[PDB]
Amino acid sequence: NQFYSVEVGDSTFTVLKRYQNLKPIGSGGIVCAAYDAVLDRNVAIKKLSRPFQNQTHAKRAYRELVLMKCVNHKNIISLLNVFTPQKTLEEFQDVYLVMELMDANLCQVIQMELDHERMSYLLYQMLCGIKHLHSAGIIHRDLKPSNIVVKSDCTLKILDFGLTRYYRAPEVILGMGYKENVDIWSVGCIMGEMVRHKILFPGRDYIDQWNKVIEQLGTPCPEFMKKLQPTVRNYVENRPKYAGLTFPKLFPDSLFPADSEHNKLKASQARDLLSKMLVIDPAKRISVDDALQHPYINVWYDPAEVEAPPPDEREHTIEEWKELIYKEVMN
Ligand SMILES: CN(C)CCCC(=O)Nc1cc(C(=O)O)cc(-c2n[nH]c3cc(Nc4ccccc4Cl)ccc23)c1
């Protein structure tokens, strides 16, 4: 047999024999660290249990499997291998996805005191990854630190393809319609969180989250309000009003290292970029291309990374999703 089974965490992993020394990593999906004896390197193995168990799980698993094949960029997940230990469609239960083993997820990195060298390079790569997605017509809308992983040399990869809701843009929260700079918002939320070491807009639901947005950034302009459908517009127009805080007060000097002129200047640059990404109205929020030209970011700008080439959506029953997924897994 090509497979063996082992108990990692609370789950059973049935994997190709090439993958050895399985060890659990992180929290959440169900993922393992392993040594791959064929490639002679360390990999991560994700177990999707019964991805066809409901139409929501199924649509996501299918969509992501299909896009992981599509895409080609060093800041986006690229699969090394995909397999099921089950031999037939009737027996089909689980899918295993294999990729590079990194060193940490971005939530761990955010907890570090980071210099501007590291923070700017992390943000640079997020923007390269996001630009690549958009170039293939993929607008993420749910970018968040827990789905981003990092190596020790600060190399980063985004692991999912989008649509914890703290990183979602106003247009997502309010059902507005969006363009590509919807994902800037989330990058802006991550950046702010790297500075504050606190989640910027930690709402338990969308009402609470909107409240924390307006409390800090201020009530948006009328121009913004009339882009909202009338009933959501009613809600938003009738919230308690807020003038909002300036970005120096949102992100005080105390948050930034002040030990050199380099760092003083980089602090002012970081706050400038933040003030252009955390903008409620997407008509006035910075784009991905403009952000890549910002002085905080442009020091890293490599056209081979920024301008790399990119290579329907119905509903189905779970029976139908199982077959669709089984097919993709088998090719
Ligand atoms: C001995 N020490 C020093 C070594 C430390 C090494 C170490 O801990 N590394 C490490 C830590 C953490 C973490 O989160 O804390 C996460 C990872 C990680 N690397 N690649 C992944 C892919 C997925 N998802 C995934 C996997 C496969 C396919 C598809 C997907 Cl989406 C999920 C998590 C990871 C690695």
φ, ψ of residue 283 in degrees (nearest 5)? -65, -25
Cβ of 105 less than 6 Å from ligand 1: yes
Chain centroid to Cα 276, Å, comes to: 20
Residue 91 and residue 133 in one domain: no
- Cα 64 to middle of ligand 1, angstroms: 18
Identify the helix (H) or strand (E) that includes residue 206. helix 206-217
d(CA 205, CA 189): 17
Residue 142 and residue 241 in one domain: yes
Query: Resolution to 1 decimal, in Å?
Result: 1.9
The domain in which residue 81 lies consists of 3-103
- Residue 276 φ/ψ region, left for φ over 0, alpha for ψ in the -120 to 50 degree band, beta for the rest: alpha
Question: Cβ(4)–Cβ(15) under 8 Å?
Answer: yes
Rg from Cα positions in the chain: 21
Residue 56 and residue 205 in one domain: no
Residue 164 and residue 291 in one domain: yes
**329 occurs within a structural domain:** no
- Residue 15 φ/ψ region, left for φ over 0, alpha for ψ in the -120 to 50 degree band, beta for the rest: beta
**61 occurs within a structural domain:** yes
Q: What CATH number does residue 234 fall under?
A: 1.10.510.10
Cβ atoms within 10 Å, residue 9: 13
Query: Residue 14: helix, strand or coil by DSSP?
Result: strand
* Residue for token pair 């990183």: 167
Residue 173 and residue 260 in one domain: yes
Residue 139 labeled ligand binder: no
- The residue out of 103, 128, 146 marking a domain boundary is 103
Question: Cβ(198)–Cβ(212) under 8 Å?
Answer: no
Which atom of ligand 1 is found nearest the CA of 160? 31
Instruction: Tell which residue, 119, 259, 130, 254, has the closest CA to residue 193.
Output: 119
Residue 150 and residue 52 in one domain: no
Which atom of ligand 1 is found nearest the CA of 100? 20
Which residues, in sequence order, are CB contacts of 193 under 8 Å at separation 6+? 110, 145, 199, 200
Cβ atoms within 10 Å, residue 238: 8
Cβ atoms within 10 Å, residue 41: 11
Q: What CATH number does residue 98 fall under?
A: 3.30.200.20
Q: Could you tell me the two tokens for 51?
A: 């991805």
Residue 163 and residue 298 in one domain: yes
Cα dihedral 236/239/242/244 (nearest 10): -40
Here the contacts of 306-313 (C-beta below 8 Å, separation 24 or greater) are 306/128, 306/131, 308/72, 308/73, 308/128, 308/132, 308/135, 309/72, 309/135, 310/70, 310/71, 310/72, 310/132, 310/135, 310/136, 311/70, 311/71, 311/72, 311/136, 313/59, 313/63
Chain centroid to Cα 166, Å, comes to: 12
- Residue 319 φ/ψ region, left for φ over 0, alpha for ψ in the -120 to 50 degree band, beta for the rest: alpha
Cβ of 99 less than 6 Å from ligand 1: yes
φ, ψ of residue 156 in degrees (nearest 5)? -130, 150
Question: Cβ(203)–Cβ(166) under 8 Å?
Answer: yes
Q: Could you tell me the two tokens for 225?
A: 């309000």
Residue 25 labeled ligand binder: yes
Between the alpha carbon of residue 272 and those of residues 243, 265, 315, the distances in Å are 19, 11, 43
* Residue for token pair 């500075």: 195
Residue 140 and residue 42 in one domain: no
Cβ of 68 less than 6 Å from ligand 1: no
d(CA 105, CA 151): 9
The tally of domains found in the chain comes to 2
* Residue for token pair 């909002």: 244
d(CA 212, CA 235): 15
Q: Could you give the strand order of the β-sheet that contains 104-105, starting from the edge strand earlier in sequence?
A: 104-105, 148-150, 156-158
Question: Cβ(39)–Cβ(80) under 8 Å?
Answer: yes
E-strand stretches of the chain: 3-8, 11-16, 19-24, 30-36, 41-49, 81-83, 94-100, 104-105, 148-150, 156-158
**Residues known to be catalytic:** 142
d(CA 151, CA 159): 14
Question: Cβ(84)–Cβ(94) under 8 Å?
Answer: yes
Strands 30-36 and 11-16: unpaired
Residue 72 and residue 153 in one domain: no
**In the PDB record, what is the listed experimental method?**
X-ray
Question: Cβ(148)–Cβ(106) under 8 Å?
Answer: yes
Residue 173 and residue 251 in one domain: yes
Which residues, in sequence order, are CB contacts of 96 under 8 Å at separation 6+? 13, 15, 45, 46, 47, 48, 81, 82, 83, 84, 85
Residue 297 and residue 160 in one domain: yes
CA atoms lying within 13 Å on the CB side of residue 4:
9
Residue 159 and residue 239 in one domain: yes
β-bridge mates for residue 13, sequence order: 6
Q: What is the DSSP letter of 300?
A: G
- Cα 101 to middle of ligand 1, angstroms: 5
